[PDB]
Design a binder for this molecule. Structure first.
Ligand code: D12
Length: 186
């Protein structure tokens, strides 16, 4: 494992932080890059068993006001538990068909995903969401988020991809996957 290589350790723990935290933006990386980060993100879970939950927050430091809307829209997603239904259409919407330009178009993605309009409007104006939006930004600050994608464990560690199983990707994934495990059981 040797810290400094695959996982760094923060000069200062974050207390009260999720067992596993991922940070992402609907604005970067682009295309296949976003879709493979997604795969990796997914496998870390088919291997992080027994009570260890994964959390994923959006970061607004990319996108401006459409970015602050997306961070709010992601809070609605987590509230409604529709993360796996709106991720790709949101991703493809903002980036691929470049159709999402306003907070309204975001709404169109949820509705076109099966979520009722009033359910969505009720969450977007709901409190739970306002508290998730603040909860997301805090986390970004607490770890002094620099950029994405990023993953932290127990609030102690910052996973570290680029000093690890280079070539391939499957080989990459099992290590990024194996690393997160330890830190949990650590
Ligand atoms: C779960 C997403 C983890 C993100 C780290 C993936 C980005 C590093 C992979 C790109 C370098 C091979």
């Amino acid at each position: 494992y040797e810290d400094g290589k695959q996982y760094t350790t923060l000069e200062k723990p974050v207390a009260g932080a999720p067992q596993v935290l991922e940070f992402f933006s609907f604005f970067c990386p682009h295309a296949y890059q976003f879709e493979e980060v997604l795969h990796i993100s997914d496998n870390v879970k088919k291997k992080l068993p027994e009570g260890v939950k994964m959390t994923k927050y959006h970061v607004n430091f990319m996108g401006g006001d459409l970015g602050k809307d997306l961070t709010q829209a992601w809070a609605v997603a987590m509230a409604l538990g529709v993360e796996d239904k709106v991720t790709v259409p949101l991703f493809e919407g903002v980036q691929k068909t470049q159709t999402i330009r306003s907070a309204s178009d975001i709404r169109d993605v949820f509705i076109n995903a099966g979520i009722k309009g009033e359910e969505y409007d009720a969450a977007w104006n709901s409190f739970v969401v306002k508290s998730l939006v603040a909860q997301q930004e805090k986390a970004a600050a607490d770890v002094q988020l620099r950029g994405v994608p990023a993953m932290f464990v127990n609030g102690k560690y910052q996973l570290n991809p680029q000093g690890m199983d280079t070539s391939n990707m499957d080989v990459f994934v099992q290590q990024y996957a194996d690393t997160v495990k330890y830190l949990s059981e650590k």
